[PDB]
Assembly symmetry: C2
Homo-oligomer: 99 residues x 2
């Protein structure tokens, strides 16, 4: 909403990040919504240089909300954007624990 | 049904992260606990735990409303056996 988008520019076919879909279920029911997480950012790629990090969730593609959209629809939004894309993400995180 | 994991060493061989799940176009969100990594050949992998799984319960105790260090502490205090309730991962990914 009020979160600042990350602008990425590519010279080749890809932005250099992997998008994974995750299912977020409501309580103990079979009801879920699909969310889009940055699973990997290629070292030295356009997304890494722009500040995108593995673990960031993408909430918007060029200001358009993606909450609920299926994985191929979000991939299509990024694909149709051209060689420049604006992604809105979750705020920066770097906390994890090996258990 | 929960995934029961048993460890013979110090760790279960999985990494936990906390993620914010925002609602639509708003700044409203809920905190979820994701299995970020599962070590190949470790206890969690052998028990069937997968990277991308979301953890909803630890030994039947719901983790909704808990922060990352509290969930880590539940797993630590469980000792060498832990039962984790998850919601499925999806090996749905694309290189973009």
């Amino acid at each position: 909403s009020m979160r600042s988008p990350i602008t990425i520019q590519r010279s080749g076919k890809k932005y250099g990040f992997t998008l994974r879909a995750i299912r977020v279920y409501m309580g103990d029911t079979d009801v879920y919504s699909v969310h889009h997480i940055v699973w990997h950012v290629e070292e030295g790629g356009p997304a890494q240089e722009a500040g995108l990090c593995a673990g960031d969730l993408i909430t918007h593609v060029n200001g358009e909300p993606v909450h609920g959209m299926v994985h191929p629809e979000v991939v299509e939004l990024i694909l149709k954007s051209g060689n420049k894309v604006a992604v809105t993400t979750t705020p920066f995180e770097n906390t994890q624990s090996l258990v």
